[model samples]
Target chain A: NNKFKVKPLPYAYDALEPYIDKETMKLHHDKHYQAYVDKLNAALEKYPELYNYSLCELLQNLDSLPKDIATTVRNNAGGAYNHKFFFDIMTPEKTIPSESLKEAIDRDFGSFEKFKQEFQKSALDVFGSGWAWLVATKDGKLSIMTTPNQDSPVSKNLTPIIGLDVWEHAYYLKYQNRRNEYIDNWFNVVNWNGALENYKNL
Target chain B: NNKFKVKPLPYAYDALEPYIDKETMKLHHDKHYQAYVDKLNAALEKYPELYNYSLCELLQNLDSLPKDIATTVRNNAGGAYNHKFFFDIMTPEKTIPSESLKEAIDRDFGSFEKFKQEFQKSALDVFGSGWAWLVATKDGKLSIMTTPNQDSPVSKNLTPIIGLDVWEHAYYLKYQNRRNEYIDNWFNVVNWNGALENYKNL
Candidate 1:
């Protein structure tokens, strides 16, 4: 049996409309994310023992996996996990971060506006298909990071709090080549409450 | 003085409609291709000696350019050159391969159906943003190739004969994530006359 399952979207396909658009949302979540899960389950099937490891554990211990399946596990498992993290932290309704997240933002990025600029810059800076993230280090420091082609920050020992998918499929229908516009409008749907929960867990 | 200009598309924006859409064609030609030309000119302006070289010349001899601007020159110059080659070889009307081109395809790829299969496989196989190409070697053997993010086969000493742009910006507006549909339809508009010309020149 496949241990992994695709997570449902936090809101309706159209819930993130005007910012992310319904068509892109449906395809991104249904097709792209489902592909990731399917490939991940197929990979896990080859390594029966790997079913013992949680998705996070499998990702965190990637260096130890057999070379035959290491990359497949990394890309597809990471893709499955990363998309869930990305979708979970997006909401139709706006949210104000808890005081601790606010303090963390000020401590690490000076202000929310400054943090947004750095995040957006990193999003735009991804040379090809990938993601931009706000991650919490083991030491509880907030940092901005990016990864190329279905990779996740968890693989690097950091906990991802917020992720912006810069992959064209994420915004191509509504924004086309104007990634900057999509990045700016994405702030309107940031699930700050989810971000705070993730931060608290870290 | 701007040495490079985006060559205009051979037909109206909507001419390739139902296969390639009007909006994608306009944006790909006017905005994306124009940006490539503009960036290529800006990159060239930094190296006065390079002013003497054509875009193809610059791309073909990238190793000789000053290292500081070499990558920029390669990408933008290649972008300008590749998009022009790609646009020039598409037409609204149907095209039948000249006997010479047909024979060459059979020799290299077994049959017309086999050639299309190999070409379409290469087109779908590009991991991210890139192009799939039918290229000719110095001795005139045809082969399938691919390049990532505006890279031209010229960089590798192969002359590109027919190119299918797999860049999301090339088809995302109309096809969304159905790249296979775009690739299949693209064959309907192939400029076999231009393909033969490029092959003969090689």
Candidate 2:
């Protein structure tokens, strides 16, 4: 029962509403995310040896796994894990950038206001189903990057602190074609505290 | 005139139908592609010296452009040029793959059938607002590559043989939300002979 289950949401599905609608959140969290998990578990079932490894471990060494199955396992497994992590901590009442995060943002991007502007613009400008992420490199530097569809920064060894899903399904039911409106609303649901904890530990 | 311009479709917008509907083509060729051109021109106007650079040259040396305008120039110019080239040559029945194209594709991907499968998958799988391209690398090799948001293979010394635009605007109106239908239709309208010409010249 534990393998590939739907992860619990930190808050109600509609908590992020006005930014993301309940229908989108419900579908994205319950339907789309569950499909990735079910497919990933189905893929892993054929290779029992992979079941024990952490999702990240399975992804990091994709070349060593069964050739015919490696990519499917990685893609679906990555999708399942990424969406779970993305939704688990984001809450409407969460804090914004803390002192450390603000300092880091300013250091990497000139100023906090500038960072917010650029980051939000990048999120808004993501032209398709993907994500805009703030990554904390192993080198202790914060960088902003984007990944295409179900892909993540971890594939390239970048540790993501926070991510904004730009997939139309994430906002379309609520914001429709107005991506900017959706992005503006996202600021309200950011889990700054959880992200800061990642910074402190990861 | 110095900035990248949005080139018109060779045929009327409705010409490629059953494959690409007029409404989709209109949004793609007129609105989305034109926006890239307008933004590119605005960026170039802010940095007059950029006029001295060739399209390929400007894109290749994007890091060397003026600090204040580099990213805008790289993104917009690349977007404008890539989408223009994509639409300008696509047609419903004018051209089929030449012998040279078949040879190159066979050499790179085993056979034309395998090549089509790989190319189609790549084009359909591109995560966001980007293009999927089949190109001839300078070393006389054919390759499949995807570039985000209007980027061109030319920016990195790859001579593009053929390309497909997968932005939602390229398919949304006629196909609604089903991207696979648009991808299926694309094979009908591809100007393979023009692609072969690029391969031969490369």
Candidate 3:
């Protein structure tokens, strides 16, 4: 168990219920994300020196790893990192962006309403399993982006402040094919205070 | 108005229940497939002469279309054609391949079980939105293949004998994160007799 472990769910499985269902949380955290962590650790077993590098370090320097196992590392490590970020930025508690964060949102996206619409559009427009992100650049500019299938913004050198997992597993139990409804409901549970913290740190 | 219409589902929405749910069938057919038909027609409006060509012809000749709209035709027309083919090759009634078809399957894949294994593996291997196809080359050699996001085997000159829609919209409602279960269950309702007809035609 010394290898990277599945992080404990930040809240009870049912805590995000009504927005995200209990079944989804249990399977996503316990089964899907757990598999990513397990596989990532297993993939790293061949090279003991790589053990000292954090998951983020392994992912960011993907080009340097042996080509034979680079893909396994990219997929599994990215899967592990992405899921942890997605789970951390959601809370059942009611939260709103701090005043400074709100100003930055307004500055970047014209207004919160406009930003919401754009983000919703991006989430819906993802053609397959992927994530929609609100990421901060090194310059601290905020923007919305999307990555396909287990890819993280960290791999591309962007600092992700918030991520919406558009992977079907995240909402299919509750929203099914009506991803629009899922996106709308998810806004209710967004941990804006957590996003604000990321913004300040960035 | 009749340039392209959604071909009706071969059976009632609930006919495939227990294996394929009524809700998934209704949405997959009525909504998702219908949108492809609608958008395919709309995308063709810019080129009236193209209307004389059948969906199959339009899809097969995509390279000759204007570069500006080629991708639109490829996505929408391919989407329309693929879904129609997908729905046509599934039925609630039990079926098995005709003797000649079984011989062809054995010849190409060594045995029916081997064919099933290859097809299921292809379906699971499609990383994102895509389709798994059991297609015949012009020379009538059967093979399993995958195509990403609204792409059809017809575009590449392969005649699809069977196709499984691997898009999340196809199974997310009932299977959620259990895509392996969805793939396994889909085999139970596969219209192998219809597939035999496709094989004979090829």
Candidate 4:
């Protein structure tokens, strides 16, 4: 079942330049993201009935999937979802959080300044190939979380507002082992407007 | 304890080039390998008595360590040990398995060519960051195994005869998502002489 398709980057490869390099963006999207999409499709080929499920549904209901494909869907579906969400929430143009989102950040995390530091720290805390995320619970309470590998917060009943990829391939071209520096650079490209939309919808 | 330190690559950075690029080796050793060494030392610092053990002993007896540091040591110490071995077992020179090891590989996997194919297949089977290992039992049985993340077969009572890192960082610079290509390229650089030495000692 080749139902899932890659969502291309919203901007050009060089759009986030000076922060994320051009070559990294090209390879990350064209190669890594496509691999996940391909593997996900192949995994689901064992049960075409799974093709009926939306990406989120596939991810959130991995327990009900065929035993052999459960882990495959958990990882590949998250990779597909996370990478799509990640690309959508980044931009060359600078963005400040909308008033409602800023108010929520202020209420939940002391201030946006505090939230930023905590987010950066969480990104650095990831031990292996994983993600550091900002997520919201059902009642819209914001939280900082980390997921090992491609595991998603959605599986834990949370809505992801933003996620920062800390995989070595994400920044290895430009940053190498300096993840802290990569986190610092990624801060500038975040599409806060997109994040605000995700928060408001939640 | 600052007892652990990164070992220098056994050859010049570009020695394995056309297969592995120079920039990749430079960072793989200087940054990635050094991070493992530094973190392993940090994790063991709280239990200085643990530093008295050799790398093999430390890995083999991980269960006896304090619970808080056990996971840290498992990942970092394995990274430290595994990277050193990976570097040691690769060379620019061509190598053939000595007759004794060749006979064992033939006995265990049918033939040296068949064993080579199985080893390559095992390398491809790794899901995330990990290694594909050819290891030996105390009774001298040969088997192929895979470990997720920086885990070593040494902990499983197997002495590694040869291991190929499938971690994305190991080949992402040149191979990207085409890991099969990396595995194929790595086949050319395997230090069979070094592996033979290990096999003979076992």
Who wins the DockQ comparison?
Answer: 1
Clashing pairs in 3: none
Q: Candidate 1: give the TM-score of chain A.
A: 0.96
In model 1, how many backbone clashes occur?
0
Q: Candidate 2: which stretches are off by over 4 Å?
A: A7-35, A42-78, A85-122, A125-163, A168-178, A185-202, B12-14, B21-23, B63-71, B93-95, B99-111, B124-129, B137-143, B167-179, B200-202
Backbone clashes in model 4, listed as residue pairs: B1-B45
Per-residue lDDT over A9-84 for candidate 1, one digit per residue giving the tens place of the 0 to 100 score: 8789999878988988889889989988888788878788887788899899889998888988888888889889
- For all the predictions, what are the DockQ values? 0.59, 0.17, 0.57, 0.56
lDDT, candidate 4, A1-202, per-residue tens: 3499999789999999999999999988998898898899998887988888898998789898889989989989989999999999899997998877888899999999999999999999787789999999989899999998889999998999989999888987788778899999998999999999999887
lDDT per residue (tens digit) for residues B12-106 in model 4: 99999999999889988998889888888888778888778878887998898889988888888898999999999999998988877888998
lDDT against the true structure, per candidate, is 0.87, 0.77, 0.87, 0.89
lDDT tens digits, residues A1-202, model 2?
4465677777898887676777667777887688778888888787777778777877677778889887787678778878887895588785877867667887998987787788898898775568898899887698888877778787888888888888766765555456788887787888888888777766
List ranges where model 3 is wrong by over 4 Å.
Answer: none
Please give fnat for model 1: 0.51
lDDT of 3 by residue, B126-202 (tens): 87689999999988899999998888889898999989998877887788667899999999889999998888886
Ranking the candidates on TM-score from highest down gives 4, 1, 3, 2
- Number of the predicted model whose TM-score against the real structure is largest: 4
Instruction: Give the range of the ten consecutive residues with the poorest summed lDDT in model 1 chain B.
Output: B42-51
Q: Name the best candidate (by lDDT).
A: 4
| CA shift of B82, model 3, Å | 1.9
